[PDB]
Design an enzyme around this catalytic site. Structure first.
Site, short mmCIF file in Angstrom:
data_model
loop_
_atom_site.label_atom_id
_atom_site.label_comp_id
_atom_site.label_asym_id
_atom_site.label_seq_id
_atom_site.Cartn_x
_atom_site.Cartn_y
_atom_site.Cartn_z
N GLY A 17 0.76 -1.24 0.00
CA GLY A 17 0.00 0.00 0.00
C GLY A 17 0.79 1.29 0.00
CB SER A 18 0.92 4.12 -1.93
OG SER A 18 -0.33 4.22 -2.59
CB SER A 21 2.27 10.11 6.55
CB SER A 22 1.71 5.08 6.26
OG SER A 22 0.37 5.38 5.92
CE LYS A 38 -1.17 2.29 8.41
NZ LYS A 38 -1.44 3.71 8.81
CG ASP A 132 -14.33 6.98 7.35
OD1 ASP A 132 -15.21 7.63 6.74
OD2 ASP A 132 -13.18 6.81 6.90
C1 LIG Z 1 -4.69 -4.55 -2.97
O1 LIG Z 1 -3.75 -5.61 -2.74
C2 LIG Z 1 -3.54 -6.04 -1.46
C3 LIG Z 1 -4.18 -5.52 -0.34
C4 LIG Z 1 -3.88 -6.02 0.91
C5 LIG Z 1 -2.95 -7.04 1.06
N1 LIG Z 1 -2.60 -7.55 2.30
C6 LIG Z 1 -2.52 -6.85 3.45
N2 LIG Z 1 -2.10 -7.51 4.54
C7 LIG Z 1 -1.98 -6.79 5.64
C8 LIG Z 1 -2.25 -5.41 5.72
C9 LIG Z 1 -2.15 -4.63 6.89
C10 LIG Z 1 -2.48 -3.31 6.84
N3 LIG Z 1 -2.90 -2.69 5.72
C11 LIG Z 1 -3.01 -3.40 4.60
C12 LIG Z 1 -3.49 -2.64 3.47
C13 LIG Z 1 -4.21 -1.43 3.47
N4 LIG Z 1 -4.50 -1.02 2.25
N5 LIG Z 1 -3.95 -1.98 1.43
C14 LIG Z 1 -4.07 -1.89 -0.02
C15 LIG Z 1 -3.35 -2.95 2.14
C16 LIG Z 1 -2.70 -4.82 4.51
N6 LIG Z 1 -2.83 -5.54 3.37
C17 LIG Z 1 -2.33 -7.56 -0.08
O2 LIG Z 1 -1.45 -8.58 0.18
C18 LIG Z 1 -0.79 -9.20 -0.93
C19 LIG Z 1 -2.62 -7.06 -1.33
#
Ligand SMILES: COc1ccc(Nc2ncc3ccnc(-c4cnn(C)c4)c3n2)c(OC)c1
Length: 256
Positions: A17-18, A21-22, A38, A132
């Site tokens: 993810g983008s 700030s993170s 993160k 939200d």
């Molecule tokens: C859109 O593609 C993915 C989204 C999430 C994940 N996995 C994942 N796992 C733990 C996370 C913890 C915190 N935030 C995210 C996150 C938040 N927005 N996106 C986007 C990922 C996580 N995503 C992913 O794994 C391969 C691909």
């Protein structure tokens, strides 16, 4: 690349993810076990902003014990310059996944729904109201949906379609406000669109969300119970709206 968090080294496999700030990275440990880190840069952050992150981290910590419907946070490393958080790696977010699939299995929707309810319910117990909710706050972790954030921290890659009438009217919030937002999500997995997606003008849309006269469309579906749950979630008056505990005792979540 690579990074260290509390003496433990992780290798960056990809960037999940983008955020302004993170960033979220898909990483592997020495034991070659996948995790999501993160990274939040603290170089230019206001004190008020700093407090919110500290609140969301503390929340992810206590809840861990209470439920597995909340993403697991294995470890964390905080400094004035940055925040590192070692979490479990999910397959994908619920929003990204929803866009990808045109049709969703009724059984999967029931499983995802019970998972969402169980997670949101936990936050409520401690007194936290997200206010939200949107699909992106959820994450598929091997057939299970988990809650990523309580909304205090900045979201990553916004919508207005999941907003409750009481939020817009105040311009108060209650655990019932989270029910509205969830009902929209469910309504989206049942009808393929959010209750007010059909309105172009965001001003008119907010008016549509708060107008008693405007009537939400509930087309006929094979699952009567499913139809009932939506109708009960999207009651504009929160006092007339169903609660999470009640939703957990519903036929839809318990009877197939
Ligand atoms: C859109 O593609 C993915 C989204 C999430 C994940 N996995 C994942 N796992 C733990 C996370 C913890 C915190 N935030 C995210 C996150 C938040 N927005 N996106 C986007 C990922 C996580 N995503 C992913 O794994 C391969 C691909």
């Amino acid at each position: 690349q690579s990074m260290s968090v509390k003496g433990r080294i992780y290798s960056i496999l990809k960037q999940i993810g983008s955020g302004g700030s993170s960033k979220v990275f898909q990483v592997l440990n020495e034991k070659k076990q996948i995790y999501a880190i993160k990274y939040v840069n603290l170089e230019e952050a206001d004190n008020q902003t700093l407090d919110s992150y500290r609140n969301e981290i503390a929340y992810l910590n206590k809840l861990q014990q209470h439920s597995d419907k909340i993403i697991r946070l294995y470890d964390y490393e905080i400094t004035d310059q940055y925040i590192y958080m070692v979490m479990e790696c999910g397959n994908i977010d619920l929003n990204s996944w929803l866009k990808k699939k045109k049709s969703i299995d009724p059984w999967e929707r029931k499983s995802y729904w019970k998972n969402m309810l169980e997670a949101v319910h936990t936050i409520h117990q401690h007194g936290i109201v997200h206010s939200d909710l949107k699909p992106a706050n959820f994450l598929i972790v091997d057939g299970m949906l988990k809650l990523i954030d309580f909304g205090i921290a900045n979201q990553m890659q916004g919508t207005v379609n999941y907003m409750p009438p009481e939020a817009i009217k105040d311009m108060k919030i209650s655990p019932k406000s989270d029910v509205w937002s969830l009902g929209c999500i469910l309504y989206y997995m049942t009808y393929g669109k959010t209750p007010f997606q059909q309105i172009i003008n965001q001003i008119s849309k907010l008016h549509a969300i708060i107008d008693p006269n405007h009537e939400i469309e509930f087309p006929d579906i094979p699952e009567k119970d499913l139809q009932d749950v939506l109708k009960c979630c999207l009651k504009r008056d929160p006092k007339q709206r169903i609660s999470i505990p009640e939703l957990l005792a519903h036929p839809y979540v318990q009877i197939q």
